Design a protein around this ligand. Structure first.
Ligand code: HEC
Ligand code: HEC
Length: 112
């Protein structure tokens, strides 16, 4: 779906779309939030209080929440579904499978 949390939407849309919490399990969000200085080659670090607040939201709304991958793009379903649907040229043009909006026009609205 859609990141509604203002702090998360603000801090985590700085270099890419704000990935919805529901897309990763809690342990993956915790892992990512624990090493923001070394976040996929970039320094995404935050002040501690903010880090904990964002992490709490992500964990509470995670894929395995009530009611260790680091990438959505490495999940079993993701690999399986995109293998059929994405040409090598589509991938070349989008530059990375992380760039959901290059292919999904409604990504920022939770529409895939
Ligand atoms: C720039 C300084 C960044 C900020 C701030 C945040 N992220 Fe990031 N993220 C960044 C890069 C360079 C990448 C790799 C992109 C690529 O093409 O390989 C990522 C990737 C992610 C991912 C993985 C996407 C995927 O392939 O499935 C996630 C889940 C992610 N980032 C989350 C995330 C969060 C929660 C952030 C705020 C704390 C955040 N990112 C900030 C660069 C930057
Ligand atoms: C182009 C290079 C793409 C990028 C980058 C991402 N996606 Fe994608 N996705 C793409 C296509 C052509 C399709 C098939 C469309 C169809 O209706 O059949 C998809 C499919 C999905 C789906 C649906 C999965 C299913 O159960 O069938 C989802 C949920 C999805 N894509 C999500 C997604 C995310 C989160 C991305 C960034 C991390 C992302 N996609 C990138 C093409 C491309």
């Amino acid at each position: 779906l859609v990141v509604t949390d203002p702090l998360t939407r603000t801090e985590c849309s700085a270099c890419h779309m704000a990935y919805p919490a529901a897309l990763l399990p809690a342990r993956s969000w915790t892992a990512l939030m624990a090493d923001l200085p070394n976040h996929f080659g970039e320094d995404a670090s935050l002040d501690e209080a903010s880090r904990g607040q964002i992490e709490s939201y992500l964990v509470a709304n995670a894929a395995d929440s009530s009611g260790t991958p680091l990438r959505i793009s490495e999940l079993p379903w993701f690999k399986r579904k995109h293998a059929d649907e994405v040409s090598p040229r589509m991938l070349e043009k989008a530059r990375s499978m992380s760039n959901c909006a290059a292919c999904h026009t409604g990504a920022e609205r939770g529409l895939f």
